């Protein structure tokens, strides 16, 4: 339930091939950017960084949870379906 | 006739398994009609 890892913007790159090492079965890669993850304060900072580096990019809008209407008293409604059958 | 020396709650010596529910069944005719929530249950 913690939300502290949803505060900042991230930039990552498209995933590329990983294959099994013939000797040990380890995951090999030829992609030098496979682990690069950048952190940004705002979407505009992330876009600015990508542009000046010449990277094509996609932006995904932030998904804030919408405010909910919570009422403990609703658990015990006289004539509504929100009445709980158990606690 | 003021006898303050005997126990006058002896009726319950003759109560049985269904005494309470028989009285509730007997009382059924004296009740007012119940209120309604508007539906058969919270799951309706």
From Swiss-Prot, chain A:
The biological process GO terms on file are: brain development; electron transport chain; mitochondrial respiratory chain complex I assembly; reactive oxygen species metabolic process; response to cAMP
User: What's a single GO CC term here?
Assistant: respiratory chain complex I
* Listed name of the protein: NADH dehydrogenase [ubiquinone] iron-sulfur protein 4, mitochondrial
Q: Which UniProt keywords apply?
A: Electron transport, Membrane, Mitochondrion, Mitochondrion inner membrane, Phosphoprotein, Respiratory chain, Transit peptide, Transport
Role played: Accessory subunit of the mitochondrial membrane respiratory chain NADH dehydrogenase (Complex I), that is believed not to be involved in catalysis. Complex I functions in the transfer of electrons from NADH to the respiratory chain. The immediate electron acceptor for the enzyme is believed to be ubiquinone.
Q: Does the keyword Aminoacyl-tRNA synthetase apply?
A: no
Report the superkingdom from the record: Eukaryota
Show which stretch of the intact protein is covered: 89 to 175 of 175
Gene name in the database record: NDUFS4
Q: Which family does it belong to?
A: Belongs to the complex I NDUFS4 subunit family.
Keyword flag Mitochondrion: yes
* Molecular function terms, GO-annotated: NADH dehydrogenase (ubiquinone) activity
Which proteins does it associate with, and in what oligomeric form?
A: Mammalian complex I is composed of 45 different subunits. This is a component of the iron-sulfur (IP) fragment of the enzyme. Interacts with BCAP31 and TOMM40; the interaction mediates its translocation to the mitochondria; the interaction with BCAP31 is direct.
Q: How is it modified after translation?
A: Phosphorylated.
Main location group: mitochondrion
Residues that bear Phosphoserine: 85
The protein's location, in the record's own words, is: Mitochondrion inner membrane
User: Where are the stretches annotated Disordered?
Assistant: 61-87
Swiss-Prot record, chain B:
Where, per the database record, does this protein carry Phosphoserine? Answer: 41
- Subcellular compartments: Mitochondrion inner membrane
This protein's superkingdom?
Eukaryota
Query: Can you state the subunit structure given in the record?
Result: Complex I is composed of 45 different subunits. This is a component of the flavoprotein-sulfur (FP) fragment of the enzyme.
The record's similarity note reads: Belongs to the complex I NDUFV3 subunit family.
Q: What does this protein do?
A: Accessory subunit of the mitochondrial membrane respiratory chain NADH dehydrogenase (Complex I), that is believed not to be involved in catalysis. Complex I functions in the transfer of electrons from NADH to the respiratory chain. The immediate electron acceptor for the enzyme is believed to be ubiquinone. May be the terminally assembled subunit of Complex I.
Task: Indicate what this protein is called per its UniProt record.
Answer: NADH dehydrogenase [ubiquinone] flavoprotein 3, mitochondrial
Q: Which residues of the full protein are shown?
A: 66 to 109 of 109
């Amino acid at each position: 339930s913690g939300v502290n890892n949803t505060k900042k913007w991230k930039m990552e790159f498209d995933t590329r091939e990983r294959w099994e090492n013939p000797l040990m079965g380890w995951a090999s890669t030829a992609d030098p950017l496979s682990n690069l993850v950048l952190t940004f304060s705002t979407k505009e900072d992330a876009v600015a960084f990508a542009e000046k580096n010449g990277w094509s990019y996609d932006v995904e809008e932030r998904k804030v949870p919408k405010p909910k209407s919570k009422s403990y008293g609703a658990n015990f409604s006289w004539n509504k379906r929100t009445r709980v059958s158990t606690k | 006739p003021f006898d303050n020396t005997t126990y006058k709650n002896l009726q319950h010596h003759d109560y049985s398994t269904y005494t309470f529910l028989d009285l509730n069944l007997d009382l059924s005719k004296f009740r007012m009609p119940q209120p309604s929530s508007g539906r058969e249950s919270p799951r309706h």
